[PDB]
Design a protein around this ligand. Structure first.
Ligand SMILES: CC(C)[C@H](N)C(=O)O
Ligand SMILES: [Ca+2]
Ligand SMILES: [Ca+2]
Length: 348
């Protein structure tokens, strides 16, 4: 029959825009592959499952996929959703390739079925920790995190790397996802002389910290990672977003080879920023591996991914024995005004 492929993502909630990056990128790839003859002569059927960035909801989504005969899942977005959902998939013969979950644990559990098109946070924290050392040598650094597996994980990888290169944070604090008032923490950071705020977490909380920090007169730069790369940050944060820093892969939309693809998304009215092409590529990889493997059986395609190499919107993609991709590493971005005059992220 058709090859049933699920999108497991935050289609609603604070991270809906990310959920839409993943959905649109996955739907466009299925559309393109199908018009090309599908996977090994078979058409791809997309199903959608909304995890609302909640682990328990993600587990329910995963069990549903299992039931609907899903064979491949592109997703999820959050590490804390992906890690538990992957067990459910591992047990019920379903290959999961995440375009966005970066926590090392995802691929460090020996599971047959876990792959990514994105990097991992030992890599990302490496880069950031070093950068803090290469540019804020004597700054009073606060490390703040959202108490999630992703957010605390990245903040810990960043702290580890920084601590090691010589930089010793003056504060290390967790906040709760959904919290809206950071005055106390901000008042704490001001007493501490904080001039750099390193945030392991997502854009919602990040934008509020930026906004309120400026309003309380804390002159500190926020440095974060992949979780803040959505154009909503500028709205949440306001003009205070200027000068914010964050790590992320090289922007795939800037790849000359993607020019026509990017233009197609844009003609459809969607700006395929950030994780959109990472998701497109997840789909490319499944198709490329299945062809190399002469099979659409998930266990076999998984073996194919680990062995083969495949053309994608992200470049030539290969995978190591754990399912991690071999691709260009994390680079630093700064938030500045674009041509249109609004703040966005540009590689330094
Ligand atoms: C959600 C995403 C931005 C993050 N990399 C995570 O693993 O949760
Ligand atoms: Ca998480
Ligand atoms: Ca390999």
């Amino acid at each position: 029959m058709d090859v049933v492929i699920a999108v497991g993502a935050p289609l609603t909630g604070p991270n809906a825009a990310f959920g839409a990056q993943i959905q649109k990128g996955a739907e466009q790839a299925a559309k393109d592959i199908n018009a090309a003859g599908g996977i090994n002569g078979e058409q791809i059927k997309i199903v959608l499952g909304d995890d609302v960035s909640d682990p328990k909801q993600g587990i329910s989504v995963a069990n549903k996929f299992v039931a609907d005969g899903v064979k491949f899942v592109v997703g999820h977005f959050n590490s804390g959703v992906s890690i538990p959902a992957s067990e459910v998939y591992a047990e019920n013969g379903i290959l999961e390739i995440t375009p966005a979950a970066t926590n090392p644990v995802f691929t460090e559990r020996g599971l047959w079925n876990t792959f990514r098109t994105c990097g991992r946070d030992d890599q990302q924290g490496g880069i950031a920790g070093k950068y803090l050392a290469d540019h804020f040598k004597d700054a009073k650094v606060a490390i703040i995190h959202d108490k999630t597996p992703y957010g605390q994980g990245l903040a810990d990888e960043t702290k580890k790397a920084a601590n090691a290169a010589g930089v010793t944070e003056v504060m290390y604090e967790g906040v709760n996802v959904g919290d809206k008032d950071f005055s106390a923490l901000i008042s704490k950071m001001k007493e501490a002389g904080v001039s750099i705020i390193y945030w392991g977490g997502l854009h919602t909380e990040a934008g509020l910290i930026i906004r309120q920090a400026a309003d309380q007169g804390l002159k500190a730069k926020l440095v974060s990672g992949d979780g803040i790369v959505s154009n909503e940050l500028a709205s949440i944060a306001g003009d205070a977003v200027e000068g914010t820093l964050n790590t992320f892969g090289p922007d795939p939309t800037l790849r000359p080879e993607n020019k026509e693809l990017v233009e197609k998304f844009k003609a459809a009215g969607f700006n395929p920023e950030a994780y959109t092409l990472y998701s497109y590529a997840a789909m490319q990889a499944i198709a490329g591996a299945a062809k190399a493997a002469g099979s659409v059986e998930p266990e076999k395609v998984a073996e194919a991914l680990k062995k083969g190499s495949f053309p994608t919107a992200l470049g030539e993609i290969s995978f190591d024995e754990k399912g991690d991709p071999k691709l260009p590493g994390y680079v630093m971005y700064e938030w500045k005004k674009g041509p249109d005059g609004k703040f966005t992220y540009i590689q330094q």
